[PDB]
C-alpha cells in the first residue's frame, strides 16, 4: 500500500497500538476546545451533511461520525486502523445508528469503500501540525471525494515566531551538561559534551508559554486541503523574514497551528495559538543550541525545512540569520522525540 511504502512497520505498530487505548481516545475527546469546535463546525454547517455521504478518516471512538449523523448525514463510512474500530462499532450499536454509521476497520490507504463521498472529515493534526504524517492519509482519502466535494478541515495554517526564554534554554543546557563532567564516578564524560547538546536540542519542546516571550509578528504557512496532493507534504519548505519588535536573545522558534472548516454556511476556526485557550496540542518550540542576538528593527530571515521520514514524522532543519550582523544558527530537529515539559 501507499501507507506501508512510506512507513516502517516498527513505527506503524507502535502508532496504532497507542491509539487502540481507550485512555488515549479519552485524552483527545476531553479536549473541549477540540471536540466542541469540531462539533460546532459540523452542526453549524448542517447543509454540508444533511442527506450526504461522509468519510471519517481515522474515526477513533466514532465521535466525529456521530456529529456528522447529528447534522443529518445519510451515510458515514468511519475508517479506523487501530483496534479502536471494534469499540466504535459498539458505540454505533449502543446509539442506534447502525443504519447511518458504518465502521470500516483498516487504514484508509488499504480499505475499499462502496461509493464516493460528498465530504471528508478528519482530525489528522499532530503537534506542529504535521507530526504523525496523518495529513497525508487525509489527502490520500480524496480519491473517494466526489468532484466539488468538501473537506473538514479545509485549510491549515502553521504559524511561527521567534521567542526569548532563557530559563528554557538553561534547563535544556543544564541536562546536556551532565556530559561535560570530567570525573563522573572517576570517569571523564566530557568528550560526549557536543553529542549530548546535539541530542537535547534536537528535541522540540511541547508546552505553553506567555505571548510576551515572542519577539515578532508570526509568519504563516498555509496548506489548502481541498487542493494539496499527498506528495506536497514529503518536503515542506517554510521561508521566513521576521521584523524584530524587541531587542534581545532569540532562543528559537515557536510554532502553532490553526485549522478552518470552510462551510457553505460559515467558516469555523480551531486555533492552537498561545493567545487562545489551551488544547492538548499545546505549542511547540525549536530551540537553537546557541541563541542569536537581535535588535528591535533587525530582520531574522531563513528557512524551516520539513523532510518526511518513515517513522511517521519529520526531519526538521531551521537555518536562521540576523541579516544585520550575519549571525546564523543552523539546527536539526527530530520531531518524533519531543520533550513534553508541561507541568
Amino acid at each position: 500500500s501507499v501507507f506501508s511504502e512510506r512507513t516502517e512497520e516498527s513505527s506503524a505498530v507502535q502508532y496504532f497500538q497507542f491509539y487502540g487505548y481507550l485512555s488515549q481516545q479519552q485524552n483527545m475527546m476531553q479536549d473541549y476546545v477540540r471536540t466542541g469546535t469540531y462539533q460546532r463546525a459540523i452542526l453549524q454547517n448542517h447543509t454540508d451533511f444533511k442527506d450526504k455521504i461522509v468519510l471519517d478518516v481515522g474515526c477513533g471512538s466514532g465521535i466525529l461520525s456521530f456529529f456528522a449523523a447529528q447534522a443529518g448525514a445519510r451515510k458515514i463510512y468511519a475508517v479506523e486502523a487501530s483496534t479502536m474500530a471494534q469499540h466504535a462499532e459498539v458505540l454505533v450499536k449502543s446509539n442506534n445508528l447502525t443504519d447511518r454509521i458504518v465502521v470500516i476497520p483498516g487504514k484508509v490507504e488499504e480499505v475499499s469503500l462502496p461509493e464516493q463521498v460528498d465530504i471528508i472529515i478528519s482530525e489528522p493534526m499532530g503537534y506542529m501540525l504535521f507530526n504523525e504524517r496523518m495529513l497525508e492519509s487525509y489527502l490520500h482519502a480524496k480519491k473517494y471525494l466526489k468532484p466539488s466535494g468538501n473537506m473538514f478541515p479545509t485549510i491549515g495554517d502553521v504559524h511561527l515566531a521567534p521567542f526569548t526564554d532563557e530559563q528554557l534554554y538553561m534547563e535544556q543546557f543544564t541536562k546536556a551538561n551532565f556530559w561535560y563532567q570530567p570525573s563522573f564516578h572517576g570517569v571523564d564524560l566530557s568528550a560526549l559534551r557536543g553529542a549530548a547538546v546535539d541530542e537535547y536540542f534536537r528535541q522540540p519542546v511541547v508546552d505553553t508559554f506567555d505571548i510576551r516571550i515572542l519577539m515578532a509578528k508570526s509568519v504563516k504557512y498555509t496548506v489548502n486541503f481541498l487542493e494539496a496532493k499527498e506528495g506536497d507534504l514529503h518536503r515542506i519548505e517554510i521561508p521566513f523574514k521576521f521584523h524584530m519588535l524587541h531587542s534581545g536573545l532569540v532562543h528559537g522558534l515557536a510554532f502553532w497551528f490553526d485549522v478552518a472548516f470552510i462551510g457553505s454556511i460559515m467558516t469555523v476556526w480551531l486555533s492552537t495559538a498561545p493567545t487562545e485557550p489551551l488544547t492538548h496540542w499545546y505549542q511547540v518550540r525549536c530551540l537553537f543550541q546557541s541563541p542569536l542576538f537581535a535588535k528591535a528593527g533587525d530582520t531574522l530571515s531563513g528557512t524551516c525545512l520539513l523532510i518526511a521520514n518513515k517513522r511517521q514524522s519529520y526531519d526538521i532543519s531551521i537555518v536562521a540569520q540576523v541579516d544585520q550582523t550575519g549571525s546564523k544558527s543552523s539546527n536539526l530537529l527530530d520531531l518524533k522525540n519531543p520533550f513534553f515539559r508541561y507541568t
Binding site: 497507542f18 485524552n27 479536549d31 499532530g126 511517521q312
Partner: peptide
C-alpha cells in the same frame, strides 16, 4: 506518544 496528555 503521538498526542500529548491534556
Amino acid at each position: 506518544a503521538p498526542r500529548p496528555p491534556f
